[PDB]
Amino acid sequence: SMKVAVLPGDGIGPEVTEAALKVLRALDEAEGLGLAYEVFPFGGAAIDAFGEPFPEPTRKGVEEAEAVLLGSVGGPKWDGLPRKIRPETGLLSLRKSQDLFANLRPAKVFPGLERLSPLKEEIARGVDVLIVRELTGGIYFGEPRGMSEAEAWNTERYSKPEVERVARVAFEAARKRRKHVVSVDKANVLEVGEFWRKTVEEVGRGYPDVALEHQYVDAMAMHLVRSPARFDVVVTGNIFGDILSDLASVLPGSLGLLPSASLGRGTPVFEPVHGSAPDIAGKGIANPTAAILSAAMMLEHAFGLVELARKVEDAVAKALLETPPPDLGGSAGTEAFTATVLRHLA
Amino acid sequence: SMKVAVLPGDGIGPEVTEAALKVLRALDEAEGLGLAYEVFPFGGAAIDAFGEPFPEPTRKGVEEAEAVLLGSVGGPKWDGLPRKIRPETGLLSLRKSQDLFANLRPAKVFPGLERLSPLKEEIARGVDVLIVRELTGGIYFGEPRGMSEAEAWNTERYSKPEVERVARVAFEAARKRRKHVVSVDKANVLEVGEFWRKTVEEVGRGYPDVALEHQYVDAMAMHLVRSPARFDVVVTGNIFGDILSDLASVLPGSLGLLPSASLGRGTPVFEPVHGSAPDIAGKGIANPTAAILSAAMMLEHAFGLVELARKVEDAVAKALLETPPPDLGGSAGTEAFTATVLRHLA
Numbered sequence: 001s002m003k004v005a006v007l008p009g010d011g012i013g014p015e016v017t018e019a020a021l022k023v024l025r026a027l028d029e030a031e032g033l034g035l036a037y038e039v040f041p042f043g044g045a046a047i048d049a050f051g052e053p054f055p056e057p058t059r060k061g062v063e064e065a066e067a068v069l070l071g072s073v074g075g076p077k078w079d080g081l082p083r084k085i086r087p088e089t090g091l092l093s094l095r096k097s098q099d100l101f102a103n104l105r106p107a108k109v110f111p112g113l114e115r116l117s118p119l120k121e122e123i124a125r126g127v128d129v130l131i132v133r134e135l136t137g138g139i140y141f142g143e144p145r146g147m148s149e150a151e152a153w154n155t156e157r158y159s160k161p162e163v164e165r166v167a168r169v170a171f172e173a174a175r176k177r178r179k180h181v182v183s184v185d186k187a188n189v190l191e192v193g194e195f196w197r198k199t200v201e202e203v204g205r206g207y208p209d210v211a212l213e214h215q216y217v218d219a220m221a222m223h224l225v226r227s228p229a230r231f232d233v234v235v236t237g238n239i240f241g242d243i244l245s246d247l248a249s250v251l252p253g254s255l256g257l258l259p260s261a262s263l264g265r266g267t268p269v270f271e272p273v274h275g276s277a278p279d280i281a282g283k284g285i286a287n288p289t290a291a292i293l294s295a296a297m298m299l300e301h302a303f304g305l306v307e308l309a310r311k312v313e314d315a316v317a318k319a320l321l322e323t324p325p326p327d328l329g330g331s332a333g334t335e336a337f338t339a340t341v342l343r344h345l346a
Numbered sequence: 347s348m349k350v351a352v353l354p355g356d357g358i359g360p361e362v363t364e365a366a367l368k369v370l371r372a373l374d375e376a377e378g379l380g381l382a383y384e385v386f387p388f389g390g391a392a393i394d395a396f397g398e399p400f401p402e403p404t405r406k407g408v409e410e411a412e413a414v415l416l417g418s419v420g421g422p423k424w425d426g427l428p429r430k431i432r433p434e435t436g437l438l439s440l441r442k443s444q445d446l447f448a449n450l451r452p453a454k455v456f457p458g459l460e461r462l463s464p465l466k467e468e469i470a471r472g473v474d475v476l477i478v479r480e481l482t483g484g485i486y487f488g489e490p491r492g493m494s495e496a497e498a499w500n501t502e503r504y505s506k507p508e509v510e511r512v513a514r515v516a517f518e519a520a521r522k523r524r525k526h527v528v529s530v531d532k533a534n535v536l537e538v539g540e541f542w543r544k545t546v547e548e549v550g551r552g553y554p555d556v557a558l559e560h561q562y563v564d565a566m567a568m569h570l571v572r573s574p575a576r577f578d579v580v581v582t583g584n585i586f587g588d589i590l591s592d593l594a595s596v597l598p599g600s601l602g603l604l605p606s607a608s609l610g611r612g613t614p615v616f617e618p619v620h621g622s623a624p625d626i627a628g629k630g631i632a633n634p635t636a637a638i639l640s641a642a643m644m645l646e647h648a649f650g651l652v653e654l655a656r657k658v659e660d661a662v663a664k665a666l667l668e669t670p671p672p673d674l675g676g677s678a679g680t681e682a683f684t685a686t687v688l689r690h691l692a
């Protein structure tokens with residue numbers, strides 16, 4: 001079996017999700033995967049239908065599935081909503097309800113595609129970095145939090161077990177990759193950074209076969225641009241991971257390329273890093289690469305189909321070289337780009 | 347006249363600071379500026395002699411001077427000491443005591459040097475962005491803050507007057523440049539971001555001639571790499587400013603290229619945005635560009651010597667294209683490079 005909860009969301013979310021659905025359907029037919037999917041409302045669409053971005057039928061659908069394929073959420077239609085029901089809060093609520101504390105974001109420059117990077121070729125070449133981002137803690141969820149007319153406040157905080165568990169995922173991922181972890185904090189300025197580093201260092205003792213290095217977040221942003229090829233796994237807290245993963249997104253040359261996996265205690269979630277791009281929704285141009293590669297991450301991580309995930313990745317890489325979408329200077333529409341991916345899969 | 351407190355600091359700090367002083371003496375000679383300056387112990391140097399990084403006599407000198415020319419602080423010798431008594435903390439104390447809420451970091455790619463940028467030439471051409479970072483509030487100084495065996499916490503908080511005063515600096519700076527400001531927050535997840543955005547918006551109304559735009563911090567990190575050329579002034583909080591300013595610093599191709607001004611209630615501070623670079627200390631190769639441009643910002647912001655700051659800057663620019671330092675593919679040591687700047691200043 002292969003039970004998938006599909007949450008298309010808003011803007012280009014449904015378009016890119018349908019592209020990823022075509023890739024999955026074509027694999028189901030060829031490999032006999034027994035895929036069964038069901039579509040649920042989430043985000044702006046759920047707010048308009050149920051009054052909340054992560055409504056009951058959707059929460060039930062997620063908990064009962066083996067994996068979630070997620071689109072994108074948000075748009076100006078919902079600007080000004082009380083924070084508790086913003087599309088963005090529904091997203092945090094999804095991550096939190098399944099306690100998906102480990103967010104995996106791979107930034108990779110495919111061999112031959114250095115041209116597309118905004119960086120000079122020799123710097124972009126061989127880039128293959130995995131950002132492990134702590135997703136259900138830190139300032140995103142910390143209390144106290146609030147605002148009055150005179151001030152506003154949010155609390156960046158971590159407990160020992162929260163740091164331990166995300167650190168352990170980073171070490172396990174590194175062990176399967178190039179056995180190198182860079183942990184990122186602001187320990188020269190903050191107590192939380194200090195605490196972060198101390199705990200990651202302790203977890204590191206359990207993995208003496210993996211090299212551990214620490215970097216300050218400001219210096220890390222800089223390294224991700226000057227020498228990204230020297231990184232294997234990067235582990236950091238919620239907001240630092242949010243920032244650095246968008247920054248890494250530029251290495252391949254575009255934001256519509258980065259897929260992601262959210263793993264923890266409950267139903268794993270797979271979503272393209274990009275937002276809902278309201279400006280281009282329904283215009284048949286959104287690059288579906290991120291969504292497709294997220295479906296690839298789902299195959300590997302949720303279903304253990306490593307070989308299949310790589311076929312998709314290989315097909316996408318050829319499609320990018322052959323007929324790139326407009327965001328990479330090409331003229332291939334969402335539909336045509338997906339068809340290209342399909343031919344290579346054959 | 348011109349009363350300056352000089353804080354060389356640790357590592358390359360004294361060398362690069364000395365280089366900047368040679369530029370300053372040259373101008374005091376050629377222009378008769380009435381330059382009076384005294385050297386004070388700061389950072390690790392202050393720790394060795396007084397047992398603290400920011401002792402009473404250095405505090406006194408700072409407060410009696412009209413401007414501070416600071417080198418850099420930190421080094422392996424002082425690792426191990428509690429964070430609270432680090433040279434880096436003495437730097438935070440200096441900033442806090444003079445309530446220098448506005449940190450100006452101009453990341454610029456001088457015409458002809460696009461080649462040194464990690465970015466492709468067309469992207470790096472004409473880059474001229476000023477980061478206005480709030481420097482005395484936010485998480486860096488937020489109460490409550492702490493650590494136990496079980497967890498640690500820090501508080502990202504801003505008051506209305508704190509956001510208003512840094513925002514104003516941003517608008518005034520823009521008004522002198524290209525009339526565009528981008529304010530940067532994480533309003534979609536953080537109450538403090540919503541509060542920041544709302545306050546910058548109200549201040550913005552007093553500047554109907556300046557264009558105002560808001561970007562999320564993760565998207566902004568991306569834009570500083572894909573299209574830095576579209577930005578003029580960028581204003582943001584303490585930690586977001588720390589990250590984006592290091593990011594912007596990579597654009598012209600080195601560390602050694604970025605100066606900064608710290609402006610506020612007390613004595614203004616001018617320092618190069620780079621660490622003590624412990625390894626190359628006393629070897630005479632460190633790029634003094636950032637220290638020299640920092641004294642140039644001093645001339646402008648502390649003494650209103652616009653024209654002179656500019657002559658210093660054009661001189662440095664031609665020195666870079668004529669005799670580049672080791673850190674930018676060249677072989678011009680600290681003193682030889684300074685002499686080139688001296689030669690162009692006449």
Ligand SMILES: CC(C)[C@H](C(=O)O)[C@@H](O)C(=O)O
Pocket residue numbers: 088091242273534535564
């Ligand atoms: C939409 C926003 C809340 C979200 C986040 O900050 O996690 C997005 O930026 C991302 O990175 O998935």
Ligand SMILES: CC(C)[C@H](C(=O)O)[C@@H](O)C(=O)O
Pocket residue numbers: 188189218434435437588619
């Ligand atoms: C050394 C450190 C405390 C300092 C900061 O974080 O402000 C430095 O990174 C900077 O950007 O000037």
Ligand SMILES: [Mn+2]
Pocket residue numbers: 242243246564
């Ligand atoms: Mn993000």
Ligand SMILES: [Mn+2]
Pocket residue numbers: none
């Ligand atoms: Mn003259």
Ligand SMILES: [Mn+2]
Pocket residue numbers: 218588589592
């Ligand atoms: Mn910094």
Ligand SMILES: [Mn+2]
Pocket residue numbers: 611612
């Ligand atoms: Mn005072």
